[PDB]
Design a protein around this ligand. Structure first.
Ligand code: HEM
Ligand code: HEM
Lengths: 362, 362
């Protein structure tokens, strides 16, 4: 129920322990007024400071003038902060506005088309994103709802995705969660304590070429549908062969324990772990931070199920792209389809109470 | 930790309200009564394992490598999480298996209500399973595995995820708020009120349908809220719609949440005044609904609301009179009923040899 500090050299919500729930929103910008957008970023930052401390936005949820709408919509009253983090990112399309063309980071690369992609353009892209993570879904929805309200007339929600449970880990001391295929997902990630690895693989540095992004990161989001009918009729051995880890313990094939190091040559050549491992990708390493989803039925008698894959990295071109390119032959591809995609530049942290989201850019 | 599965009544009605819901409606594809009975027995056996935190069948791993696992594995390592699984039978089931003369009279078709905009695809269903647990992955796992066991005999027609409070951070005695920011559940039937349950919730043998003794009747309504319209209303308008204040949730003119309402102080079309038993000839409901937030629609609006669940001894004397009385509810401006279903929820599974539906099928 505790608060996660909002201020820092980096935004929270990346290296932070992974919270139970996600509400991710992508927004498009509808104002051409730079000043008006800056004013919004400042108002959003002020709101975020309140929300992440478990306080209502503005002048509160009640006790104001009866004839005015409340400043806060009120559905989080009486709730703890619930480890809420709010992480903002800027999409490539933002940089066509407000005289920002020359400030688009090279590391903010458009993704190439990957074999098997079936991207819904309506649930892809976005000028900006807010990732709300919390242990309480109500706290996360409240945050997104109030941000959108504050932004009325300046931004619209383009698409959103709720995640009912995590399928990632930045805390190797704690139990690794399972995805909806039944496997542990997050064993070999980057932990929030691994400062050297975060600097090497996750945080943008000044020397990378875009000074305003120093201390930020780059985010890839992929909405991935899972073919659970197809998966659920596969044998145990087929499932384990797909990954290169056993299902029960999640140990690498041949070994006894989850956290024993993979011996890649014992895996099938098309095993997911083998193809995704840094050693198979010239050292490319990602911070994975995704969540599971189910959005009803598919209209053909089955549950809908998928994984909202999020990865943070220092450079999209040296993180997600190489690794996804190497998954072209993945055995897992029989059972998944990417159906939504977005990339974002996640700026540096809000340093103190006078700072604001995007201040280094604007 | 866990809730007993066996009882005179099914669990999940009068037992403590858990933090999360996965509700699924199923349609039956087989015409063979014997095949359906066999399915009910297999599902009962699965439910016994699931509610005790155990995998279905021979487990999620460690069986024959060349066989699909009996349990899909995504709840391994999780706790029982107070899982309850409650089954119900829709009116349409009774057109199968020679059952037409065993449809309870209390399982009434709902009339059309003013302002209904029901999606046929998220309405009805031959049967339902209500899965409630504190961990949504435990609930989803239960539905996913029941659906799998049933493949070839049943299909999933529609599915809804929902959330109430998060118990780890929110005291049990605090009333949850709905997404309109009002406390929701103050004046309800509590599972401690054994006589009120007998009067208003459980079917009695003398009511007309012996197989349903100890069962109940369920109305499910998917109710969208027009969030962005509501959030533009003044605080006064919002309070006037309900007849309670927003901060404390006290009836107008009173000081505390649990102060008994004075109906005449409320506006004539206030929700509480219209829905109160005194306004409806004494009609009283067990509400056990959950909030939902599914995402955003094509206009960028929040697809959110209340998945309303009411249990009652007879649909004709519970939901129908109360909902009829809400014809002029001030709340109607901000809500729309977009899905509907009714179910007969049979008596409890008495012991280890009993099975869901045994009083009906014989
Ligand atoms: C639905 C899609 C996916 C599923 C079900 C899935 C599942 C898994 C599982 C079970 C593991 C092993 C445990 C672990 O170390 O985390 C794993 C590892 C990994 N996955 Fe995936 N994954 C998916 C998509 C992706 C994608 C899209 C990428 C990157 C483009 C990726 C990158 C990785 C990486 C880097 C590892 C760790 C490999 C290592 O260093 O040992 N995964 N995944
Ligand atoms: C989105 C839709 C709805 C919302 C937001 C809503 C909200 C509320 C709220 C805030 C209260 C007062 C606190 C409480 O006693 O729980 C209440 C009471 C109640 N509601 Fe609703 N409600 C909705 C729909 C319905 C429907 C469809 C029915 C029945 C057909 C219903 C029946 C009741 C009853 C019986 C009470 C208790 C009245 C009393 O005895 O004081 N509600 N509702």
């Amino acid at each position: 129920g505790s608060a996660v500090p909002f201020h820092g050299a980096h935004q929270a919500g990346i290296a932070t322990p992974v919270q139970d729930r996600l509400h991710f929103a992508a927004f498009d910008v509808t104002t051409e007024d730079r000043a008006a957008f800056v004013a919004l970023l400042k108002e959003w930052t002020a709101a975020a400071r309140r929300l992440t401390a478990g306080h209502a936005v503005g002048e509160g949820a009640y006790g104001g003038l009866p004839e005015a709408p409340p400043d806060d919509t009120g559905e989080a009253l009486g709730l703890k902060p619930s480890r809420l983090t709010l992480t903002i990112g800027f999409g490539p399309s933002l940089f066509t506005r407000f005289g920002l063309a020359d400030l688009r980071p090279e590391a903010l690369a458009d993704l190439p088309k990957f074999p098997g992609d079936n991207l819904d353009r309506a649930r892809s892209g976005g000028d900006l994103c807010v990732q709300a993570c919390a242990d309480d879904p109500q706290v996360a929805v409240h945050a997104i709802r109030n941000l959108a309200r504050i932004g009325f007339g300046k931004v619209v929600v383009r698409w959103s995705q709720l995640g009912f449970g995590k399928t990632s880990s930045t805390t190797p001391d704690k139990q690794t969660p399972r995805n909806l295929l039944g496997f542990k997902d997050g064993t070999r990630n980057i932990a929030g304590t691994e400062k050297d690895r975060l600097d090497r693989f996750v945080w943008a540095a000044e020397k990378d070429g875009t000074p305003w992004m120093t201390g930020g990161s780059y985010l890839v989001a992929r909405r991935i549908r899972m073919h659970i009918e197809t998966w659920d009729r596969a044998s145990l051995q087929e499932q384990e062969d797909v990954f290169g880890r056993d299902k029960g313990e999640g140990a690498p094939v041949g070994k006894a324990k989850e956290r024993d190091e993979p011996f890649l040559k014992a895996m099938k050549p098309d095993a997911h772990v083998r193809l995704a491992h840094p050693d198979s990708n010239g050292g490319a390493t990602l911070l994975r931070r995704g969540y599971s989803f189910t959005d009803g039925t598919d209209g053909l008698g089955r549950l809908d199920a998928g994984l909202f894959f999020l990865a943070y990295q220092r450079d999209i071109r040296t993180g997600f792209v190489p690794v996804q390119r190497n998954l072209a032959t993945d055995a897992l591809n029989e059972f998944i389809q990417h159906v939504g995609s977005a990339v974002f530049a996640v700026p540096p942290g809000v340093r103190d109470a006078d700072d604001w989201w995007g201040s280094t850019l604007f």
